[PDB]
Point group: C3
Chain length 153, copies 3
């Protein structure tokens, strides 16, 4: 009755150059506020490490915000958030979830969240992580706006 589980909450995000056309990954707050990691759930190196094989329900919401770029017609821009796992086996990451949506707004600006949640079978030693299209667009402001979680079922 003490299954591994953790709810991570956003932070400012220390800028750290990433590969070109490569999706940046966020790092989080894991012990302050509403965040936490327990029952051997280890959040290390911007990774959420799995303490044991089994089926976990992982979820994450990422609120994006920005000034209207809206440019015929103009080909839409896109914001996207992806949750992926990396294993001992193929170091080649496997995308589990991906909420991607077109954005061609009007008005002073815009802002909206992308929430995904599902259940996958992970093996101990697996490392989860969220990635996003554009880091500068993630609202790091509030704790209840951008989060990431996972718990053994």
């Amino acid at each position: 009755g003490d299954k591994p589980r953790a709810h991570l909450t956003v932070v400012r995000q220390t800028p750290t150059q990433h590969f070109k056309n490569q999706f940046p990954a966020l790092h989080w707050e894991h012990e302050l506020g509403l965040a936490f990691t327990k029952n051997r759930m280890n959040y290390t190196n911007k990774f959420l490490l799995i303490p044991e094989s089994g089926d976990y329900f992982i979820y994450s919401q990422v609120t994006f915000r920005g000034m209207t770029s809206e440019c015929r017609p103009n080909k839409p821009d896109s914001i996207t958030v992806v949750i992926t796992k990396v294993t001992d086996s193929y170091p080649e990451p496997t995308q589990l979830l991906m909420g991607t949506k077109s954005v061609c707004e009007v008005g002073s600006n815009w802002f909206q969240p992308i929430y995904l949640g599902a259940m996958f079978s992970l093996q101990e030693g697996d490392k989860l992580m969220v990635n996003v299209s554009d880091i500068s667009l993630v609202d790091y402001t509030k704790e209840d706006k951008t989060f990431f979680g996972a718990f053994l079922l």
Copy 2:
């Protein structure tokens, strides 16, 4: 085993202006239809008191709808926030929050907002959902706007 859990569906939700405030909490149906409360967890006037302390998964969708309003000008918006109120500390702490900027371009619009996340709630704590604008909230169907939680 069998632990606490519940699934509330939307209802009428009459208007108001009592106690003067913003981000009105919604009312739910705790039994009629797909709705239900079990294992010591009960709905009680906008709240959802937790029977047993432990880790919970709170979730909820609130379908919004309204007639398009002209809108470079700062856009209006919609938001839904789930709150945890505890007797120990008065100040209700916001757990979740989905805010979407609205600025349509047609007859009208609609679109739900869904939020799901796990938290470590305390026994005797009270959960409730709040929305930017109570009137925009759709009350037609129960599968459109719901709100629940269970003990993991």
Copy 3:
């Protein structure tokens, strides 16, 4: 211990005969990739048959993708997705969840996902199916973009 659970994933999709005035259901992948069914959870005939009574968490995400339509302004277009529960008793469906949003996207094309999830009490033999407003709008391209799942609590 051994609780029923299954995570299904989208596939190209095969045209089906148009008979009644109803929502098209989706059929999926239940073994390859991130897909799976276990502990007596049976995926048969486009339905997710419930092995045991009790409470389940049903979830699904359908990423829609289309071409910009046109829109006293013009009434908006819309897309929907609804998880339906069909009982052994009355053959009449029972819409459990329902996600529907309008669309007037001003741009070349668009695309956006719709995620829904909730806990219900289901009986044995009961079936579950995901329906959509427009089949041809569903993005079947990736497994993580359109999925359907459920597990016992």
